[PDB]
């Protein structure tokens, strides 16, 4: 007590969700003409890395991208000329995430050392330097993104999300409603709220200004591994190890599409959306990512790479290209 | 020709490429080891016998070899994750106890964890060195109160090399995969001989690999 009150509240909220609407997204959109098969080919081959890579990010203007490797090196690639703008050596070899700020001044990177530090790219000395080392968490970092020029949001294995501040160098907020290891987060196009996953098959939406979650969707089976919004910010479709991709609506507050295929039984490492919100890319294991139609929920052309094994993929702001990175130290640009 | 500044940019790119390749070839000669244990293991003994809230890295030189030892004890998350980060590791080191068998049992859980980590998907072609710590400690414990164990059907002799040999054979079991050898050694944590056996194990692993290329194996 009052555990029975909690379970009856869960039952009544489930009944309300069931009775909210009669929509099923199956009788509708079936008559809408689907898009044809989509074919992609490799257009660039970034072969400057030497070991496993985990995550990468696209900078603003869709020409510069950043990637991280187990060799403890950050490379600021150039999409067009395939030259390397910078080569930042890191203090800690183990790295699990790297993010590029909206302005090219700063870049964040972190890993198992419980710290995702900041590096400056524009200075009089003309060389990269340590800007700030931020140590607030205890568990391993997952991903810290930039919400402003001097404000970042972190995700650590200690089941906390903090939303650090650069100049002060101290935590200004904390989120502790997951009760499970977080894995990814993606800020919405609007800069007042975001969402983050957890290892207990639950995704929770947090408010930037306020301190508590709002919805706490729990409509998944096994785990959560990647979350990413699409414009207008109402889907943040996610994938997991259960070979299932699902998208949730904040207002609907109920499962909508729950993509699934019987042939494939694998995991998911990263998920991204397109510019128009029609095609969503998801990198599976088995070493070959896939593309899925947002509306018709059918399957399009399989992708070739990589050798071993696809781990991250990102889509530029203009959508002119997609970057994919795999453990074989190969970054490929596909159009 | 393409332009003026782009030629300089390409030259800088080649220069940093050469620097990166040199750094990588320099860093590819060292050997890395992963130390994993359990509750009340010999972490302190191994750390002190080498000669903040995160993973500890210890690098030391012994006979023209730069050993890089990584131990993960401060992490509180599930070991099923982040374990793939150490896929490319030369060898791992395990410590058991001996004489932990009737306390919050200990050897049963340690053996279960060892079997679980020895039979996972992507971590198979990696050698495991296993240490028999507290060698002098369990003699009096087995002498005073034999034997027993809560692990039944032992049906063997009493003291004392027999029990150690039986435990070593039991731990050497569960190696379903072929072409993978598990090394065992017992230390009193008194003298300084662990470095020598680690070096011998490492050179044996290196020989088994190169020999592998001709394969041939």
């Amino acid at each position, epitope marked *: 007590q009052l555990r029975q009150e909690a379970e009856q509240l869960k039952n009544q909220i489930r009944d309300a969700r069931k009775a909210c609407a009669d929509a099923t997204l199956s009788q509708i959109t079936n008559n809408i003409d689907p898009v044809g098969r989509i074919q992609m080919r490799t257009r660039r081959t970034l072969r400057g890395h030497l070991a496993k890579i985990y995550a990468m990010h696209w900078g603003t203007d869709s020409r510069l991208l950043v990637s991280a490797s187990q060799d403890g090196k950050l490379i600021i690639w150039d999409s067009y000329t395939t030259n390397k*703008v910078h080569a930042i050596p890191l203090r800690s070899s183990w790295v699990m995430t790297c993010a590029y700020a909206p302005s090219g001044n700063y870049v964040a990177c972190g890993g198992l050392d419980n710290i995702c530090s900041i590096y400056n790219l524009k200075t*009089r*000395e*003309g060389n990269v330097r340590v800007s700030r080392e931020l140590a607030g968490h205890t568990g391993y970092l997952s991903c810290c993104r930039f919400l402003d020029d001097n404000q970042i949001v972190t995700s650590s294995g200690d089941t906390t999300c903090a939303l650090w501040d650069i100049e002060t160098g101290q935590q200004t907020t904390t989120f502790t409603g997951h009760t499970g290891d977080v894995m990814s987060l993606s800020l919405a196009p609007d800069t007042r709220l975001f969402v983050s996953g957890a290892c207990d098959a639950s995704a929770k939406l947090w408010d930037v200004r306020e301190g508590m979650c709002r919805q706490t969707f729990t409509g998944h089976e096994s785990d959560i591994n990647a979350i990413c919004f699409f414009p207008n910010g109402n889907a943040f479709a996610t994938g997991s190890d259960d070979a299932t991709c699902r998208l949730f609506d904040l207002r609907a507050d109920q499962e909508l599409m729950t993509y699934s295929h019987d042939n494939i039984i694998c995991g998911i490492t990263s998920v991204s959306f397109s510019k128009s919100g029609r095609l969503l890319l998801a990198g599976y294991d088995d070493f070959n990512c896939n593309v899925w139609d947002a509306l018709k929920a059918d399957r399009a052309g399989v992708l070739a790479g990589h050798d071993n094994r696809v781990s991250c993929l990102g889509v530029t702001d203009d959508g002119m290209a997609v970057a994919t990175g795999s453990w074989d130290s190969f970054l490929k640009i596909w159009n | 020709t393409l*332009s003026a500044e782009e030629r300089a*940019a390409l030259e*800088r790119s080649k*220069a940093i490429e050469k620097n990166l390749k040199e750094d990588g070839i320099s860093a590819a000669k060292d050997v890395k080891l992963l130390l994993l244990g359990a509750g009340e293991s010999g972490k302190s003994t191994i750390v002190k016998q080498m000669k903040t809230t995160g993973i500890v890295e210890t690098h030391f030189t012994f006979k023209n070899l730069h050993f890089r030892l990584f131990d993960v004890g401060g992490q509180r998350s599930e070991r099923k994750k982040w374990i793939h980060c150490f896929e490319d590791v030369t060898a791992i080191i395990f410590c058991v106890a001996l004489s932990g068998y009737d306390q919050v049992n200990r050897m049963h859980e340690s053996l279960m964890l060892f079997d679980s980590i020895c039979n996972n998907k992507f971590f198979i072609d990696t050698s495991i060195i296993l240490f028999l710590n507290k060698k002098d400690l369990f003699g009096e414990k087995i002498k005073k109160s034999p034997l027993t164990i809560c692990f039944p059907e032992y049906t063997g002799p009493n003291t004392y090399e027999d029990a150690a040999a039986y435990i070593q054979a039991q731990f050497e079991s569960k190696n379903r995969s072929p072409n993978k050898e598990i090394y065992c050694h017992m230390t009193c944590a008194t003298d300084t001989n662990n470095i020598q056996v680690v070096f011998d194990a490492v050179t044996d692993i290196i020989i088994a690999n190169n020999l592998r290329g001709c394969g041939l194996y």
Partner: single-chain antibody
Amino acid sequence: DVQLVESGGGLVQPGGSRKLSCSASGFAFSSFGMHWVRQAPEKGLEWVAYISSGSGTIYYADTVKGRFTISRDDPKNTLFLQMTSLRSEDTAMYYCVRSIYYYGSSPFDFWGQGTTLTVSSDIVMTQATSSVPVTPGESVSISCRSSKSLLHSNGNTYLYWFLQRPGQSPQLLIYRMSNLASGVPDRFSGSGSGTAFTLTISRLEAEDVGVYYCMQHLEYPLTFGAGTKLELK
């Protein structure tokens, strides 16, 4: 902070030898490329030599090749230049300039303090008129004409601008004739087609009175034009 210091000037008999050396301490000298700039005793500017960051690429001017040599010593953060068989026309005052080349760079941003040495086809640019009567608080525009179109197929226009205060080392204003260098007020602005280039200065005040220079970086050799100076009528 960044600061370039050199001291190699003096009275030299014609047909002599001399060494010029400039030292950098305010940044990473090993990762930058050095330029040498000559300033005629009255108004002129002329390019001399360039050495890359890796010292694997060397260029020279038409009137400089075969007489002068350039080198740099990376551990000591120093640049060396050799004057050999110098002639009467070589009397001038010299600059050594830092430059880095990558995407979104600002080369020729910082210029050092010069030293004076006394004695005893190619793209051309034109400016006019060298004398413009202007008053503070009124907008002014300065244009310079180039021979060949600067619009490369990459969508970039390799043109740079410089301002020289009376009695002080020149500093960069605009790079690639479309961006704005750091430490420059927003009042400055410059634009043009692939051939003609013109600034757009708004709310001019009583300190931006130095002579203006426009330079081309499309291909070697780099050439400067005859600048135009303002006044306080």
